[PDB]
Design a protein around this ligand. Structure first.
Ligand SMILES: Cc1cc2nc3c(=O)[nH]c(=O)nc-3n(C[C@H](O)[C@H](O)[C@H](O)COP(=O)(O)OP(=O)(O)OC[C@H]3O[C@@H](n4cnc5c(N)ncnc54)[C@H](O)[C@@H]3O)c2cc1C
Ligand SMILES: C[C@@H](Oc1cc2onc(CCC(=O)O)c2cc1Cl)c1ccccn1
Length: 448
């Protein structure tokens, strides 16, 4: 049986552990954190993720989708909150088959850990990867106290997240050609209780957005009607705009409350623990990191956040990481040797990771912001009605299909260009020749 060592019992690492172990690989998975399945008396907090078709299909192939969905809240559409107007529900898709699912991260990781173990993988917690000796094929792990443990390895999978230790170790034996693009927004998680969401009639089956230009809030629902709110706000005010809101200006919870009361007046009343959440929850960091190289011969490979940290605005990080896990297990299982598998996996996935990284950056403006854009959207709806297999909104291609991200981006660009051109020099839809636009759709967009 082929042997593999996986670092990181997160989303991609646990999925790939299950896929390989059920194919008879000898799998050992090392995780820095304790096993979350071991109940303690610690007070934990709910972070929610939006599971979409790419992630759901990966779970489906693994035989875990039913279990995960049983614990997920359907989000039918985007509920946009702008003071003055009642919340506007913009359905994500054609019907309830085209929805996204809000899942609690802890519940998902419990299911995935159980799944990896049921397939035969051995999971070792409280062991953080410290270093790798590629030449000697040994690695060093340690617990939080720094007590070291050395292990031999044959194949090393870096599923160890955005601050990957495997990536740092590889960066010493190969030039990874890393390009880090910092993102100016930090984030803070805040809570809405089940009583508060019910009192303020907050729709449970939707993803909520409070757009505010350079900053915004979103909220994702839980099974118990609580919501996790995420505030996206610049860490610092830029030199050009010194008065502009930023985390630096919010010196404490009381400052955060005043900011919410002024800028998010319909949200502030739902945030009962705003002060406490602001002071006790750490401000998160966002970034895009692109690597030229994801593997070292047949010895080691990166996937998920370890390979391609991306900004969160498309809700695709987990979806992409689970899609990577399936691809890596497929390549490893069927290749002539590990070196061939890792090279083929990297070649296949790299263009798609670049595409989703670019599309995720572009989705911020779609969420946080129109005049001409409404006419484009109106024309886009007609094109999608006349040619549903050709004109598929980019959001639908990324979220509800398994089309390679690079292809979703390329088709989205053709669609965006056609709409922009077709609406230019037009006041309304009555002056636009719908058949000429449709002819360009059938000419430029092959049916899917
Ligand atoms: C709050 C939040 C909400 C998000 N919401 C969404 C969403 O709505 N939709 C979406 O698709 N994506 C979302 N994402 C992104 C998504 O969570 C990540 O893209 C995804 O978890 C990446 O999976 P991974 O397996 O590559 O990394 P992770 O799931 O982060 O797993 C990495 C694992 O490696 C472990 N580890 C780290 N360093 C070491 C080490 N040295 N040794 C051993 N173990 C180590 C970590 O403890 C962890 O268990 C969200 C991210 C955050 C932070
Ligand atoms: C909750 C998650 O943020 C998002 C999840 C998401 O799912 N789907 C979307 C797109 C929704 C749309 O266009 O209508 C989306 C956006 C974000 Cl910011 C998050 C929090 C903090 C750190 C990283 N990730």
């Amino acid at each position: 049986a082929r042997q593999v060592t996986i670092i990181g019992a997160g989303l991609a690492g646990t999925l790939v552990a299950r896929l390989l172990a059920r194919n008879g690989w000898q799998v050992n998975l090392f995780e820095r954190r304790p096993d979350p399945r071991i109940e303690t008396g610690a007070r934990g907090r709910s972070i929610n993720l939006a599971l979409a078709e790419r992630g759901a299909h990966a779970l489906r192939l693994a035989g875990l989708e039913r279990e995960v969905l049983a614990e997920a809240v359907m989000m039918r559409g985007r509920m946009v909150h702008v003071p003055g107007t009642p919340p506007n529900l913009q359905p994500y898709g054609r019907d309830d088959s085209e929805v996204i699912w809000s899942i609690n991260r802890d519940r998902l990781n419990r299911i995935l850990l159980d799944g990896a173990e049921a397939a035969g993988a051995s999971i070792h917690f409280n062991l953080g990867l410290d270093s790798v000796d590629f030449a000697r094929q040994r690695l060093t792990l340690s617990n939080v106290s720094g007590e070291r443990l050395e292990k031999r390895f044959h194949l090393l999978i870096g599923a160890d997240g955005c601050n990957s230790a495997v990536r740092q170790a590889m960066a010493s034996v190969v030039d990874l050609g890393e390009h880090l693009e910092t993102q100016p927004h930090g984030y803070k998680e805040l809570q809405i209780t089940p009583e508060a969401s019910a009192q303020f009639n907050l729709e449970p089956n939707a993803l909520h957005i409070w757009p505010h230009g350079d900053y915004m809030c979103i909220a994702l629902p839980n099974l118990d009607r609580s919501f996790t709110v995420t505030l996206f706000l610049h860490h610092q005010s830029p030199a050009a705009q010194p008065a502009s809101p930023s985390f630096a200006q919010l010196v404490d919870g009381h400052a955060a409350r005043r900011f919410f009361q002024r800028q998010f007046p319909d949200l502030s009343p739902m945030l009962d623990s705003l002060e406490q959440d602001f002071e006790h929850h750490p401000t998160g960091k966002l970034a895009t990191l692109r690597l030229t190289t994801w593997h070292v011969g047949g010895q080691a490979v990166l996937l998920g956040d370890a390979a391609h940290p991306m900004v969160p605005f498309h809700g695709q990080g987990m979806n992409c990481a689970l899609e990577d896990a399936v691809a890596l297990a497929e390549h490893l299982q069927s290749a002539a040797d590990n070196a061939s598998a890792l090279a083929a996996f990297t070649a296949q996935r790299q263009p798609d990771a670049l595409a989703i990284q670019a599309m995720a950056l572009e989705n911020y403006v779609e969420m946080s912001s129109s005049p001409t854009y409404l006419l484009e959207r109106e024309l886009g709806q007609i094109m999608a009605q006349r040619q549903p297999t050709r004109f598929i909104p980019r959001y639908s291609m990324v979220t509800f299909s398994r089309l390679p991200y690079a292809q979703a981006m390329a088709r989205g660009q053709i669609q965006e260009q056609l709409l922009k051109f077709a609406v230019a020099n037009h006041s309304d839809l009555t002056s636009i020749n719908l058949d000429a636009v449709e002819h360009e759709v059938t000419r430029c967009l092959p049916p899917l």
